[PDB]
Amino acid sequence: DDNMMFITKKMIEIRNLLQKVGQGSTVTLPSIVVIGSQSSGKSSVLEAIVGHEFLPKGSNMITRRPIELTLVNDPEAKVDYGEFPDLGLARVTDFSLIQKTLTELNQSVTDDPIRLTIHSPNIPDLSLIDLPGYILKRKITELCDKYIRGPNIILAISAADTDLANSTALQASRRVDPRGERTIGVITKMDLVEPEKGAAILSDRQYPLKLGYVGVISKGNLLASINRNEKNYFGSHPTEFGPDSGVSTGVMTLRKKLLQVLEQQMSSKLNETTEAIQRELEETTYQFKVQYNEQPMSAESYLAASLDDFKHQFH
Amino acid sequence: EFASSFGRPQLQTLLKDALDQKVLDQLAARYWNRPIEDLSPAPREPDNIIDLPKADPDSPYWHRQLDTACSGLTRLGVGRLAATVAASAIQQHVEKLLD
């Protein structure tokens, strides 16, 4: 089902190349945006870390700049390693170093969002961005709202202790998405609630959406262990949230859903985006004629013609 | 009887028409004007089709534009266009025969 992960990785690389083309490359492909209120914002950070592998997160985060995570299927690679594009060609083995570096970027604080790239075999390639969660506060909200508007596959996490209505995350998710078509929900911190409790949250009708909600508890060999606990815990109250139950939970199903949504939405945006690139290629090509007669040029060919003219003059 | 009736020149006109519409597709996307909203246009503005006849030959919206138009037309899924058009013709004639 390899062909499958692959469509996404090809698109993610293409998302990067649109992002990098140039000034008028207003054009881009969508991606996952992640919002969460404070307890919920903490649940969301935890979750992002947990989805793949431990990474520097939380503690004290100014949350002023977004972090564009781009993941890569890492089969044939046996070392968990993450690299920064602006810090090009550098690979980082231990995430503690990635803690020091990105969190000092966190204390430096333009609004530009740092790009990131991590390769790990258990992780499926994705393209999520983590912006600061809701708690000056106005200005953070302002960025959040602007990012949510555009058709990115958004959404939300919500801690089990808070009422669903009370949480800003799902509340803005509903504000910018009335239909709930492009937004997925996650109920975190679910470990300390009765199974009656998971049932009412994991499945609700007060606020229905497509792609459903996903409940999970996130928090060496940490991956597998977080997996182990999810496999182990539901056994406590299996009938309340397990097979054939309407709710869905644990990190893996939530991930494959993420794969599906991302492949589908991106694929919708591909047409309009592509005609856009053909229009900007035609603009660049036409300017290439009016300016410099479309001839290929290198700096050495320029340098040769002058040097030559100078020697005959000097003679 | 229909298979003895059908043959090839039917395909001829069929593919020649769809490649015409593709010709209209290329020409517009590469040469002509675009939709209108209150938003002001791209400038552009050396790309005026009118000074095409009495122009000097080495001008792109001429040279490079035609050049990329033909490269684009040939390196388009003409293979897949013929396939699907012959597909929808044969499919139609079998649905006419079923009536």
Coordinates of C-alpha atoms in Angstrom, one line a residue:
Chain A
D1 CA 0.0 0.0 0.0
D2 CA 3.2 1.7 -0.7
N3 CA 1.8 3.5 -3.8
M4 CA -0.3 5.0 -1.3
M5 CA 2.0 6.8 1.1
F6 CA 3.9 7.9 -2.1
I7 CA 1.3 10.2 -3.6
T8 CA 1.5 12.2 -0.5
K9 CA 5.2 12.4 -0.4
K10 CA 5.3 13.6 -4.0
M11 CA 2.8 16.3 -3.2
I12 CA 4.5 17.3 -0.1
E13 CA 7.8 17.9 -2.0
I14 CA 5.7 19.9 -4.6
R15 CA 4.2 22.0 -1.7
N16 CA 7.7 22.9 -0.7
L17 CA 8.7 23.9 -4.2
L18 CA 5.7 26.1 -4.6
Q19 CA 6.5 27.6 -1.3
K20 CA 10.0 28.4 -2.4
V21 CA 9.5 29.5 -6.0
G22 CA 9.7 33.2 -5.7
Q23 CA 8.0 36.6 -5.0
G24 CA 4.7 36.2 -6.9
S25 CA 4.4 32.6 -5.9
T26 CA 1.5 33.6 -3.9
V27 CA 0.4 30.0 -5.0
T28 CA 0.5 27.0 -2.6
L29 CA -0.8 23.6 -1.5
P30 CA -2.8 23.0 1.7
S31 CA -1.7 21.2 4.7
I32 CA -2.8 20.4 8.3
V33 CA -3.1 23.3 10.8
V34 CA -3.3 22.4 14.5
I35 CA -5.1 24.7 17.1
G36 CA -5.7 24.1 20.9
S37 CA -6.7 26.0 23.9
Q38 CA -4.4 26.2 26.9
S39 CA -5.0 22.8 28.6
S40 CA -6.0 21.8 25.2
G41 CA -2.9 23.5 23.7
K42 CA -0.8 21.5 26.0
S43 CA -2.7 18.3 25.0
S44 CA -2.0 19.2 21.3
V45 CA 1.7 19.8 21.8
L46 CA 1.9 16.4 23.6
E47 CA 0.1 14.9 20.8
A48 CA 2.2 16.2 18.0
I49 CA 5.2 14.9 19.9
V50 CA 3.6 11.6 20.4
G51 CA 2.4 11.1 16.8
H52 CA 5.8 10.2 15.7
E53 CA 8.6 10.4 18.2
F54 CA 9.6 12.6 21.2
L55 CA 10.7 16.2 20.1
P56 CA 11.4 19.4 21.9
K57 CA 8.1 20.9 22.9
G58 CA 6.0 22.8 25.4
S59 CA 7.6 23.8 28.7
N60 CA 7.8 27.6 27.9
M61 CA 6.8 28.5 24.3
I62 CA 6.3 32.0 23.2
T63 CA 4.4 30.3 20.4
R64 CA 5.0 33.5 18.3
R65 CA 6.2 31.6 15.2
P66 CA 4.6 28.6 13.4
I67 CA 6.5 25.4 12.8
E68 CA 6.0 23.8 9.4
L69 CA 6.6 20.1 9.9
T70 CA 7.3 18.1 6.8
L71 CA 7.7 14.3 7.4
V72 CA 9.2 11.6 5.1
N73 CA 8.6 7.9 5.0
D74 CA 11.9 6.5 6.4
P75 CA 11.8 2.8 5.3
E76 CA 15.5 1.9 4.5
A77 CA 16.7 4.4 7.0
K78 CA 17.6 3.1 10.4
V79 CA 18.5 6.3 12.2
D80 CA 15.9 8.8 13.7
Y81 CA 17.2 12.0 12.4
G82 CA 15.6 15.5 11.8
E83 CA 17.1 18.3 9.8
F84 CA 16.4 22.1 9.2
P85 CA 16.1 23.5 5.8
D86 CA 17.7 27.0 6.5
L87 CA 20.3 25.0 8.4
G88 CA 20.8 23.1 5.3
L89 CA 22.7 19.8 4.9
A90 CA 22.8 19.3 8.7
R91 CA 21.5 16.2 10.2
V92 CA 20.7 16.0 14.0
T93 CA 20.7 12.6 15.8
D94 CA 19.5 13.4 19.4
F95 CA 16.3 15.6 19.7
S96 CA 17.8 17.3 22.7
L97 CA 19.9 19.3 20.3
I98 CA 16.7 19.9 18.4
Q99 CA 15.2 21.1 21.7
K100 CA 18.1 23.6 22.3
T101 CA 18.0 24.9 18.7
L102 CA 14.3 25.3 18.0
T103 CA 13.5 26.5 21.5
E104 CA 16.3 29.2 21.3
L105 CA 14.5 30.2 18.1
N106 CA 11.5 30.2 20.4
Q107 CA 13.3 32.8 22.8
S108 CA 14.5 34.9 19.8
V109 CA 11.1 35.1 18.3
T110 CA 8.7 39.0 11.2
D111 CA 6.2 36.1 11.9
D112 CA 8.1 33.8 9.6
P113 CA 7.4 30.1 10.1
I114 CA 10.4 27.8 10.5
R115 CA 10.4 24.7 8.2
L116 CA 11.4 21.3 9.6
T117 CA 12.1 17.9 8.1
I118 CA 12.2 14.7 10.1
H119 CA 13.0 11.0 8.8
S120 CA 11.8 8.1 11.0
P121 CA 10.6 4.5 9.8
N122 CA 7.6 4.4 12.1
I123 CA 6.4 7.9 11.1
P124 CA 4.3 8.2 7.9
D125 CA 5.0 11.3 5.9
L126 CA 2.7 14.2 6.7
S127 CA 2.8 18.0 6.4
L128 CA 1.3 19.5 9.6
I129 CA 2.0 23.1 10.9
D130 CA 1.8 24.0 14.6
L131 CA 0.9 27.6 15.3
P132 CA 0.6 29.0 18.8
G133 CA -2.5 28.0 20.7
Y134 CA -5.1 30.3 22.2
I135 CA -4.6 31.5 25.8
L136 CA -1.1 40.3 22.6
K137 CA -3.4 37.4 23.0
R138 CA -5.4 39.2 20.3
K139 CA -2.4 39.3 18.0
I140 CA -1.9 35.5 18.4
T141 CA -5.6 35.0 17.6
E142 CA -5.3 37.2 14.6
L143 CA -2.6 34.8 13.1
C144 CA -4.5 31.8 14.0
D145 CA -7.6 33.0 12.4
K146 CA -5.9 34.0 9.2
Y147 CA -4.3 30.6 8.9
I148 CA -7.5 28.7 9.5
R149 CA -9.5 30.6 6.9
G150 CA -7.9 29.2 3.8
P151 CA -8.8 25.6 2.8
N152 CA -6.3 23.8 4.9
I153 CA -7.3 20.6 6.6
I154 CA -7.5 22.1 10.0
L155 CA -8.2 21.2 13.4
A156 CA -8.5 20.7 16.8
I157 CA -7.6 19.0 20.0
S158 CA -9.6 19.2 23.1
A159 CA -8.8 18.1 26.8
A160 CA -11.4 15.8 28.4
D161 CA -11.8 18.0 31.5
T162 CA -13.1 21.0 29.5
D163 CA -16.6 21.1 28.0
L164 CA -16.5 20.7 24.3
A165 CA -18.3 24.1 23.9
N166 CA -15.9 25.9 26.2
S167 CA -12.8 25.0 24.2
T168 CA -11.7 27.8 21.7
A169 CA -10.1 25.2 19.5
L170 CA -13.2 23.5 18.4
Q171 CA -15.1 26.8 18.7
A172 CA -12.9 28.5 16.0
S173 CA -12.9 25.3 14.1
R174 CA -16.6 25.8 13.9
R175 CA -16.3 29.6 13.4
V176 CA -14.2 29.3 10.2
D177 CA -15.8 25.9 9.1
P178 CA -19.6 25.9 9.6
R179 CA -20.1 22.7 7.7
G180 CA -17.3 20.8 9.6
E181 CA -16.2 19.2 6.3
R182 CA -12.5 20.1 6.4
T183 CA -11.8 19.7 10.1
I184 CA -10.9 16.7 12.4
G185 CA -11.2 16.5 16.1
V186 CA -9.1 14.9 18.8
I187 CA -9.9 14.4 22.6
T188 CA -6.7 14.2 24.6
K189 CA -6.0 13.6 28.3
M190 CA -8.5 10.8 28.1
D191 CA -6.8 8.6 30.6
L192 CA -8.5 10.1 33.6
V193 CA -12.1 9.7 32.6
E194 CA -14.8 7.0 32.9
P195 CA -15.6 5.0 29.7
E196 CA -19.1 6.5 30.0
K197 CA -16.9 9.7 29.6
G198 CA -15.0 8.6 26.5
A199 CA -18.4 7.6 24.9
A200 CA -19.9 10.9 25.3
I201 CA -17.0 12.8 24.1
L202 CA -15.5 10.5 21.4
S203 CA -18.9 10.4 20.0
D204 CA -21.1 13.5 20.0
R205 CA -24.0 14.9 18.2
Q206 CA -23.9 18.4 19.6
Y207 CA -21.3 19.2 17.1
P208 CA -21.0 16.6 14.2
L209 CA -18.4 16.8 11.4
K210 CA -17.1 14.6 8.7
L211 CA -13.8 12.6 9.5
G212 CA -15.0 12.2 13.0
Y213 CA -13.2 12.7 16.4
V214 CA -10.3 10.7 17.6
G215 CA -9.6 10.1 21.3
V216 CA -6.2 9.2 22.6
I217 CA -3.9 9.6 25.6
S218 CA -0.5 10.8 24.6
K219 CA 2.5 10.9 26.9
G220 CA 14.1 4.7 24.8
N221 CA 11.7 3.1 22.4
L222 CA 9.1 5.7 23.4
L223 CA 7.1 5.3 20.2
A224 CA 6.4 1.7 20.6
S225 CA 5.6 2.2 24.2
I226 CA 3.2 4.8 23.6
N227 CA 1.7 2.3 21.3
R228 CA 1.9 -0.4 23.9
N229 CA -0.1 1.7 26.4
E230 CA -2.8 2.5 23.8
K231 CA -3.0 -1.2 23.0
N232 CA -3.1 -2.1 26.7
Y233 CA -5.3 0.6 28.3
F234 CA -8.5 0.1 26.4
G235 CA -8.5 -3.4 27.8
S236 CA -9.5 -1.8 31.0
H237 CA -12.9 -0.9 29.5
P238 CA -12.8 -2.7 26.2
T239 CA -16.5 -2.6 25.3
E240 CA -16.8 1.1 26.1
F241 CA -14.0 1.9 23.4
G242 CA -12.8 -0.8 21.2
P243 CA -13.6 -2.8 18.1
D244 CA -17.0 -2.3 16.6
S245 CA -17.7 0.4 19.1
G246 CA -18.6 3.5 17.2
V247 CA -15.6 5.5 18.6
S248 CA -12.2 5.3 17.2
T249 CA -8.9 5.6 19.2
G250 CA -5.3 5.4 19.4
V251 CA -2.6 7.0 17.3
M252 CA -2.5 4.7 14.3
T253 CA -6.0 4.9 13.0
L254 CA -5.9 8.7 13.6
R255 CA -2.8 8.7 11.5
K256 CA -4.1 6.7 8.5
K257 CA -7.2 9.0 8.6
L258 CA -4.7 11.9 8.4
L259 CA -3.2 10.2 5.4
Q260 CA -6.5 9.9 3.6
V261 CA -7.8 13.4 4.3
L262 CA -4.5 14.9 3.2
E263 CA -4.3 12.9 -0.1
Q264 CA -8.0 13.8 -0.9
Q265 CA -7.9 17.6 -0.2
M266 CA -4.5 18.2 -1.7
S267 CA -5.7 16.4 -4.8
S268 CA -8.7 18.7 -5.1
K269 CA -6.5 21.9 -4.9
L270 CA -4.0 20.4 -7.6
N271 CA -5.9 21.6 -10.7
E272 CA -6.4 25.2 -9.8
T273 CA -3.0 25.4 -8.4
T274 CA -1.5 23.8 -11.6
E275 CA -3.2 26.2 -14.1
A276 CA -1.7 28.9 -11.7
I277 CA 1.8 27.6 -12.3
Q278 CA 1.2 27.4 -16.1
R279 CA 0.2 31.1 -16.0
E280 CA 3.4 32.0 -14.0
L281 CA 5.6 29.9 -16.2
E282 CA 4.1 31.8 -19.2
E283 CA 4.8 35.1 -17.6
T284 CA 8.4 34.1 -16.8
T285 CA 8.9 32.7 -20.2
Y286 CA 7.6 35.9 -21.9
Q287 CA 9.7 38.2 -19.7
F288 CA 12.6 35.8 -20.6
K289 CA 12.2 37.0 -24.3
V290 CA 11.6 40.7 -23.9
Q291 CA 14.4 40.8 -21.5
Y292 CA 17.8 39.1 -22.8
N293 CA 16.5 37.4 -26.0
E294 CA 15.8 34.1 -24.3
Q295 CA 19.4 33.1 -24.8
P296 CA 21.0 30.9 -22.1
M297 CA 23.6 32.7 -20.1
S298 CA 26.2 31.9 -17.6
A299 CA 28.4 34.2 -15.7
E300 CA 31.6 32.7 -17.3
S301 CA 30.3 33.5 -20.9
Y302 CA 29.7 37.1 -19.8
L303 CA 33.1 37.3 -18.1
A304 CA 34.8 35.8 -21.3
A305 CA 33.4 38.3 -23.7
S306 CA 34.6 41.3 -21.6
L307 CA 38.1 39.9 -20.9
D308 CA 38.5 39.4 -24.6
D309 CA 37.6 43.0 -25.5
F310 CA 40.0 44.3 -22.9
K311 CA 43.0 42.4 -24.2
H312 CA 42.7 43.7 -27.7
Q313 CA 42.3 47.3 -26.4
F314 CA 45.4 46.9 -24.1
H315 CA 47.3 45.6 -27.2
Chain B
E1 CA -23.2 -5.4 -39.1
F2 CA -22.2 -2.3 -37.1
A3 CA -18.5 -3.4 -36.8
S4 CA -18.5 -3.8 -40.7
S5 CA -20.1 -0.4 -40.7
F6 CA -17.7 1.6 -38.5
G7 CA -14.2 1.6 -39.8
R8 CA -11.6 4.4 -39.4
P9 CA -12.6 7.8 -41.1
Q10 CA -15.2 8.1 -38.4
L11 CA -12.3 8.1 -35.9
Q12 CA -10.5 10.6 -38.2
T13 CA -13.1 13.4 -37.9
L14 CA -13.7 12.5 -34.2
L15 CA -10.0 13.0 -33.2
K16 CA -9.5 16.0 -35.6
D17 CA -12.4 17.8 -33.8
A18 CA -11.2 17.1 -30.2
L19 CA -7.6 18.3 -31.3
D20 CA -9.3 21.4 -32.7
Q21 CA -10.8 22.2 -29.3
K22 CA -7.4 21.5 -27.8
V23 CA -6.0 24.0 -30.3
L24 CA -8.6 26.5 -28.9
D25 CA -7.5 25.5 -25.4
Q26 CA -3.8 26.2 -26.2
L27 CA -4.3 29.4 -28.1
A28 CA -6.4 31.0 -25.4
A29 CA -4.3 29.9 -22.5
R30 CA -1.2 31.2 -24.2
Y31 CA -2.3 34.2 -26.3
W32 CA -5.6 35.8 -25.4
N33 CA -7.4 37.7 -22.7
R34 CA -8.8 36.3 -19.4
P35 CA -12.0 36.6 -17.2
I36 CA -13.1 39.9 -15.6
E37 CA -13.7 40.9 -12.0
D38 CA -13.4 44.4 -10.4
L39 CA -9.8 43.4 -9.6
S40 CA -7.4 45.0 -12.1
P41 CA -5.6 42.9 -14.7
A42 CA -2.1 41.7 -15.2
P43 CA -0.5 44.5 -17.2
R44 CA 0.8 42.5 -19.3
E45 CA 1.7 44.2 -21.7
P46 CA 4.1 43.4 -24.6
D47 CA 1.6 40.5 -25.2
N48 CA -0.7 42.4 -27.6
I49 CA -1.8 40.1 -30.3
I50 CA -2.5 43.0 -32.8
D51 CA 1.0 44.1 -33.6
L52 CA 1.6 40.5 -34.6
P53 CA 1.4 41.0 -38.4
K54 CA 3.8 44.0 -38.8
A55 CA 6.4 43.0 -36.2
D56 CA 10.0 42.1 -36.3
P57 CA 10.2 38.2 -36.3
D58 CA 12.4 37.8 -33.2
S59 CA 9.7 39.0 -30.7
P60 CA 8.5 36.0 -28.0
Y61 CA 4.9 36.5 -27.7
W62 CA 5.5 35.6 -31.3
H63 CA 8.6 33.2 -31.5
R64 CA 8.6 31.8 -27.9
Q65 CA 5.0 31.8 -27.5
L66 CA 4.3 29.7 -30.6
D67 CA 7.2 27.6 -29.7
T68 CA 5.9 26.8 -26.2
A69 CA 2.4 26.5 -27.6
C70 CA 3.4 23.6 -30.0
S71 CA 5.7 21.9 -27.4
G72 CA 2.7 22.1 -25.0
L73 CA 0.2 20.8 -27.5
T74 CA 2.4 17.8 -28.6
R75 CA 3.6 17.0 -25.0
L76 CA -0.1 16.9 -23.8
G77 CA -2.0 13.6 -23.2
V78 CA -3.0 13.3 -26.9
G79 CA -2.5 9.6 -26.3
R80 CA -5.0 9.6 -23.6
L81 CA -7.3 12.0 -25.4
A82 CA -7.6 9.8 -28.4
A83 CA -8.2 6.8 -26.1
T84 CA -11.0 8.4 -24.3
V85 CA -12.7 10.0 -27.3
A86 CA -12.6 6.6 -29.3
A87 CA -13.9 5.1 -26.0
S88 CA -16.9 7.4 -25.7
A89 CA -17.7 7.0 -29.5
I90 CA -17.7 3.2 -29.4
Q91 CA -19.6 3.2 -26.1
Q92 CA -22.2 5.5 -27.7
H93 CA -22.6 3.3 -30.8
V94 CA -23.1 0.3 -28.6
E95 CA -25.7 2.2 -26.6
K96 CA -27.5 3.3 -29.9
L97 CA -27.5 -0.3 -31.0
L98 CA -28.9 -1.4 -27.7
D99 CA -31.8 1.1 -28.1

